[PDB]
Design an enzyme around this catalytic site. Structure first.
Site, PDB file in Angstrom:
ATOM      1  N   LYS A 107     109.899  40.040 101.048  1.00 56.69           N
ATOM      2  CA  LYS A 107     109.638  38.628 100.842  1.00 56.69           C
ATOM      3  C   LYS A 107     110.963  37.903 101.026  1.00 56.69           C
ATOM      4  O   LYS A 107     111.923  38.220 100.328  1.00 56.69           O
ATOM      5  CB  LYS A 107     109.067  38.307  99.465  1.00 56.69           C
TER       6      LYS A 107
ATOM      7  N   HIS B  18     101.457  28.453  92.484  1.00 59.40           N
ATOM      8  CA  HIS B  18     102.363  28.563  93.605  1.00 59.40           C
ATOM      9  C   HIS B  18     103.670  27.869  93.236  1.00 59.40           C
ATOM     10  O   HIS B  18     103.680  26.817  92.596  1.00 59.40           O
ATOM     11  CB  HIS B  18     101.691  28.097  94.905  1.00 59.40           C
ATOM     12  N   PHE B  19     104.775  28.489  93.663  1.00 56.23           N
ATOM     13  CA  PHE B  19     106.086  27.890  93.531  1.00 56.23           C
ATOM     14  C   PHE B  19     106.458  27.181  94.828  1.00 56.23           C
ATOM     15  O   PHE B  19     106.602  27.820  95.867  1.00 56.23           O
ATOM     16  CB  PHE B  19     107.148  28.947  93.202  1.00 56.23           C
ATOM     17  N   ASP B  20     106.576  25.844  94.800  1.00 51.82           N
ATOM     18  CA  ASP B  20     106.728  25.115  96.040  1.00 51.82           C
ATOM     19  C   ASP B  20     108.193  24.894  96.409  1.00 51.82           C
ATOM     20  O   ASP B  20     108.537  25.095  97.584  1.00 51.82           O
ATOM     21  CB  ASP B  20     105.991  23.770  96.004  1.00 51.82           C
TER      22      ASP B  20
ATOM     23  N   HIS C 154     107.071  34.772  89.689  1.00 52.85           N
ATOM     24  CA  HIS C 154     107.954  33.644  89.431  1.00 52.85           C
ATOM     25  C   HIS C 154     108.442  33.461  87.996  1.00 52.85           C
ATOM     26  O   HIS C 154     109.313  32.619  87.796  1.00 52.85           O
ATOM     27  CB  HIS C 154     107.288  32.335  89.909  1.00 52.85           C
TER      28      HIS C 154
HETATM   29  O1  LIG Z   1     112.409  27.442  96.519  1.00 53.63           O
HETATM   30  C1  LIG Z   1     111.518  28.203  96.877  1.00 53.63           C
HETATM   31  C2  LIG Z   1     110.839  28.152  98.134  1.00 53.63           C
HETATM   32  C3  LIG Z   1     109.883  29.051  98.399  1.00 53.63           C
HETATM   33  N1  LIG Z   1     109.533  30.051  97.512  1.00 53.63           N
HETATM   34  C4  LIG Z   1     108.560  31.085  97.895  1.00 53.63           C
HETATM   35  O2  LIG Z   1     107.277  30.832  97.352  1.00 53.63           O
HETATM   36  C5  LIG Z   1     106.359  30.961  98.466  1.00 53.63           C
HETATM   37  C6  LIG Z   1     105.019  30.373  98.154  1.00 53.63           C
HETATM   38  O3  LIG Z   1     104.095  31.462  97.909  1.00 53.63           O
HETATM   39  P1  LIG Z   1     103.648  31.818  96.384  1.00 53.63           P
HETATM   40  O4  LIG Z   1     104.411  30.900  95.395  1.00 53.63           O
HETATM   41  O5  LIG Z   1     102.125  31.603  96.384  1.00 53.63           O
HETATM   42  O6  LIG Z   1     104.054  33.283  96.251  1.00 53.63           O
HETATM   43  C7  LIG Z   1     107.152  30.312  99.597  1.00 53.63           C
HETATM   44  O7  LIG Z   1     106.547  30.471 100.868  1.00 53.63           O
HETATM   45  C8  LIG Z   1     108.422  31.137  99.420  1.00 53.63           C
HETATM   46  O8  LIG Z   1     108.230  32.465  99.846  1.00 53.63           O
HETATM   47  C9  LIG Z   1     110.184  30.197  96.300  1.00 53.63           C
HETATM   48  O9  LIG Z   1     109.856  31.023  95.456  1.00 53.63           O
HETATM   49  N2  LIG Z   1     111.128  29.236  96.046  1.00 53.63           N
END
Ligand SMILES: O=c1ccn([C@H]2O[C@@H](COP(=O)(O)O)[C@H](O)[C@@H]2O)c(=O)[nH]1
EC number: 4.6.1.18
Length: 121
Positions: A38, A116-118, A12
């Site tokens: 992804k 985590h990016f929500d 991210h």
């Molecule tokens: O605006 C958004 C929404 C979801 N995400 C991703 O981030 C995921 C969360 O998983 P993580 O941040 O742990 O990799 C979410 O399911 C989607 O794949 C984004 O980067 N940005």
């Protein structure tokens, strides 16, 4: 191996800068097309310190119903990568969309950092 905080940075953070091909390149290089395409993924173009600071900003509900999500007071430069309809693994294809929006991250640990990016709003 990789910590949750480190994985957040891998998935991210891109403080270094987009073009139309940014997501194709970036999703690949950050290993988000290794096992699967992804579908959705956001990169943040701010300093690590700025993004880490979000964990002490506006506390909001996470989409999964947990309480450890935080919204940036300021808008941030981001890029959303979204898989196209004609994308087929292992040649994952994305549309690249730049924007300036408030980010929401989940934070955990000591130190209390983004894991985590929500969402963006
Ligand atoms: O605006 C958004 C929404 C979801 N995400 C991703 O981030 C995921 C969360 O998983 P993580 O941040 O742990 O990799 C979410 O399911 C989607 O794949 C984004 O980067 N940005």
């Amino acid at each position: 191996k990789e910590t949750a905080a480190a994985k957040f940075e891998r998935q991210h953070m891109d403080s270094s800068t987009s073009s139309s091909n940014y997501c194709n390149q970036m999703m690949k290089s950050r290993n988000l097309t290794k096992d699967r395409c992804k579908p959705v993924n956001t990169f943040v173009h701010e300093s690590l310190a700025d993004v880490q600071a979000v964990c002490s900003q506006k506390n909001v509900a996470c989409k999964n119903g947990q309480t450890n999500c935080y919204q940036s007071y300021s808008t941030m430069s981001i890029t959303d990568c979204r898989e196209t309809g004609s994308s087929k693994y292992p040649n994952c294809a994305y549309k690249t969309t730049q924007a300036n929006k408030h980010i929401i991250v989940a934070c955990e640990g000591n130190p209390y950092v983004p894991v985590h990016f929500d969402a963006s709003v």
